[PDB]
């Protein structure tokens, strides 16, 4: 995929009505694209529910104009960012973004996307702050367990709207396992997932 193309079907987007979801995931996008697209998100007529960029190439400063964009939008509820080198700098962007108030954003996929426990306070504030956010997938992340002792102290908070975490575990030590389960107890509305426990 080449932006010439990408103009052809962000032109096209501009008479679509009613569109619901957009999938361009595994298909490479420019900055360039990026930003149009960006400019396609925040038309008042933009009615997207779903959004997947999965596998699109994008990197933190992609996350900067996807946060900027999704500022302009009640109607995008789930989106999908895996598979980008997006680094704890491109979650920081999309964290300011997640923890406001008027945020719609529902369901957000975040899998193999170069994480490390420096995103968790960030990611913690979301938890613990969002009105809307239900359903998070970091699997595939190197949070370790500095950062999902983090990521606790914000699912902890009983303003947390999360229901499904998706998280690997398996380098995770015993103690840390042990207060993930105990977490599960106590918020019996929350399933944690993995790849190897789905």
């Known amino acids: 995929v080449t932006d010439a193309y990408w103009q ?27 930003k149009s697209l960006c400019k396609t998100l925040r038309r008042p007529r933009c009615l997207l529910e779903t959004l997947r960029l999965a596998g699109c190439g994008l990197t933190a400063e992609d996350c900067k104009d996807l946060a900027f964009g999704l500022r302009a939008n009640q109607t995008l509820t789930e989106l999908d960012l895996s598979f980008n080198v997006l680094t704890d700098a491109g979650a920081k962007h999309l964290c300011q973004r997640l923890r406001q108030p008027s945020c719609k954003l529902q369901r957000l996929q975040l899998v193999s996307c170069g994480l490390t426990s420096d995103c968790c306070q960030d990611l913690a ?28 102290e914000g699912l902890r908070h009983p303003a947390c709207k999360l229901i499904r975490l998706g998280l690997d575990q398996t380098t995770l030590s015993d103690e840390m396992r042990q207060e993930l389960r105990a977490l599960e107890q106590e918020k019996p509305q929350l399933l944690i997932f993995s790849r190897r426990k789905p």
């Open 8 to 34: 052809i079907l962000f032109s096209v987007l501009k008479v679509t009505r009613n569109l619901k979801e957009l999938d361009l995931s595994g298909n490479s996008l420019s900055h360039s694209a990026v």
């Open 125 to 152: 504030s979301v938890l613990s702050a969002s009105p809307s956010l239900k359903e998070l997938d970091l699997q595939q992340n190197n949070l370790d367990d500095v950062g999902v002792r983090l990521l606790c």
